[PDB]
């Protein structure tokens, strides 16, 4: 695939603040 | 100072939800302490580990879990570890648990929720 270089805004909010990302459905991969 | 909890929405929601049973709020707040193990490498404070174990036992005992012989196995190990790490009604139970005949299931089904009330006011 590819990684998109961000064009949004980073200086203002710190490292960590960008239970809100709580989850109930998850995929699973098997080797 | 770096802490395993992001804010006071994880150090308070877990604190409130660990003892307000609902059969599903101590399960949400028991899987939010297996995440504080990763954030500390692989370690949890002895008190938190004991508290999590004593509710891991409960959520299997209340739901139904397994046979009686295989439910005082969790209860006995949890209580023995709690006493060793963190009177005579609850302190003399470990001797009967590990050295003598297996205590009756009701003895554990009283001692466990006795000691769970001891961690509600001392640590949590």
């Amino acid at each position: 695939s590819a990684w998109q270089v961000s064009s949004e805004d980073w200086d203002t909010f710190p490292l960590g603040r960008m239970a809100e990302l709580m989850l109930e459905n998850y995929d699973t991969m098997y080797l | 100072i770096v802490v395993a909890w992001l804010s006071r929405a994880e150090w308070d929601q877990v604190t409130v939800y660990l003892f307000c049973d609902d059969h599903k709020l101590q399960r949400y707040a028991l899987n939010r302490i297996t995440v504080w193990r990763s954030r500390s490498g692989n370690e949890l404070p002895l008190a938190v580990a004991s508290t999590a174990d004593l509710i891991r036992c409960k959520l299997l005992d209340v739901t139904g879990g397994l046979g009686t012989d295989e439910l005082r196995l969790l209860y006995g190990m949890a209580l023995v570890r709690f006493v060793n790490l963190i009177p005579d009604w609850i302190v003399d139970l470990r001797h009967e648990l590990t050295h003598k005949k297996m205590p009756h299931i009701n003895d554990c089904r009283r001692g466990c929720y006795f000691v769970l009330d001891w961690l509600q006011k001392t640590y949590w």
Binding site: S1, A2, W3, Q4, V5, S6, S7, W10, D11, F13, P14, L15, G16, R17, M18, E20, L21, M22, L23, E24, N25, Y26, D27, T28, M29, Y30, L31 | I1, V2, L6, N31, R32, T34, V35, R37, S38, R39, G41, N42
Partner: protein
Amino acid sequence: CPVILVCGSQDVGKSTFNRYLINHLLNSLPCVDYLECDLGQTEFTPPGCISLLNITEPVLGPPFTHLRTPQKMVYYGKPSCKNNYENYIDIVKYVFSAYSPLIVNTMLLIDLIRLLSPSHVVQFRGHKLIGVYTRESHNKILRDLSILSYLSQLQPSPLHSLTPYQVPFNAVALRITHSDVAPTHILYAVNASWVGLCKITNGPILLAQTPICDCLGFGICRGIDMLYHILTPVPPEELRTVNCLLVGAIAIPHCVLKCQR
């Protein structure tokens, strides 16, 4: 290619022997190869990595100044096995499969001599032994100093001010090595963390077993709002091959997460 091996205990001078031997060899021989089996005293890598490093320039300082790209690399996760001496030994063969004279640094001990067909048993404390005869806070600063040296390649700038990358939650896999995190509550173990950008819609695409991959670098996941905003010093050419993240027992130095200006 007389493969060289080193065996010694704490404070015997083994570390200040590969710096001198390679220095002497670099005068005559053009290149020398290096295999690192240490996990907490890594020389050319951030801590917790088993690598087959390469040397074309001499070593003239502490390990936090010779950060070079390993030829082969495996991100174990913990800078001490001490419980699972059947996976570190298993990882060594995977690293050795990419094998110029070779220096082998070592932290089991009998097996470490075997499995490599060595030609030297230099000790500094084929079985040609030349074994001549010659704490928890100082050894934890030099492990975070090397990590801070890997993050120093992002500077031309505050560490949170650089523009990060981003990848949705369907193109990069996630695994939490050396822990048991509940699958639903897995995005909190990967927020503001130190992940190894290894190689191998719905939020989680978690794996099930720990793979023996080939780590290509290290990055920081600054935040995930419900996009993997990865702050990574790996060159942009190598980012495209990155498709797996593996969290281990190595976190960001607290000074990075602490008060920034």
